[PDB]
Amino acid sequence: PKTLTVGLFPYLPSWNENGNEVKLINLIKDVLPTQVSGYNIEYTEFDCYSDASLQSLPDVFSTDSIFLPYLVSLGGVKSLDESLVRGVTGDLHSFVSSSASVNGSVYGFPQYLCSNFLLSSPNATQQASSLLELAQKVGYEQIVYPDVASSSSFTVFGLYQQLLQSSSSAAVDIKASDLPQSGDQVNKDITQKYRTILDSTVVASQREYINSVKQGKPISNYYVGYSESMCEIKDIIRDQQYNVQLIGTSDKPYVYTDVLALNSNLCDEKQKVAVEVIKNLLTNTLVLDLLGLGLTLPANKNGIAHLAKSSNFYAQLSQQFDAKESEVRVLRCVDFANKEVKNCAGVLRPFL
């Protein structure tokens, strides 16, 4: 009868000790209430990195803000009042709030924060402000960066646009015309800088790096990747005193944000229930504590502060987001999504 379909961001950490796989998204799911305000609540995994899923939105969904402006253009999302979101999330960083803003309007509740952070060892032989700077200072094959070494589509597409584009505001909104279509459109200067980072990257996966740290013999004192990817050594990061920081590939540091948005076809009775479910997701201390176990970052200052009270890891990031608040950029797409990203990455790859 009256059911609320909730689409969750499914790309959360996963623990594994051979055979048995524990997914953090399952832990969070088995904590959220299935009965709210008379409505039945269905939590399912919503893959925003699938064009098919972006074509059929649920009542409420968690999408990467990278597709948000394009998602707004389809009209499938509902505009929200500034006060309504503020009363749920609380204080938001400038880049976080701007990541949910499209055409001077808020289109969802910021849920997750992420970036390619730099995990520096205690024996950090070098310090840097950009990955280009760290590439020159340390040298050939010294930094661990799995997504760059493996040339992941979103990373190949991502870094290229970060090096190329520049903005005064936080939102770096690009169109489909700004994408290389062949090879004569590929900026060689940008591709030259990407190569320097790739040259400074060791040919090693994430699993190989983690196992090295666990065995006490790290393959490198430098690691770049998602905060969630470091969750299997969160104790070692704390004990041995590893360092984390917002580092840009060049100049400005980039950030991913996942945003809980409401469908445009929601009635007034469903809108209040959806907000209630959302307010639970963002403020429930048990949910936040579970996020802390997977080292994934809440988007609001309150969620970050809560986890910063018992984690030095979160403490550094909270200091980082505050110190470089005006410098952080967020890449977004105006009139394209996954297909055009995968295609653009395929064009760029040979020139790397």
Ligand SMILES: Cc1ncc(Cc2csc(CCO)c2C)c(N)n1
């Ligand atoms: C919380 C969080 N962590 C990481 C990401 C970034 C990501 C995760 S999977 C994926 C697909 C790559 O092919 C990307 C870009 C995100 N959006 N939110």
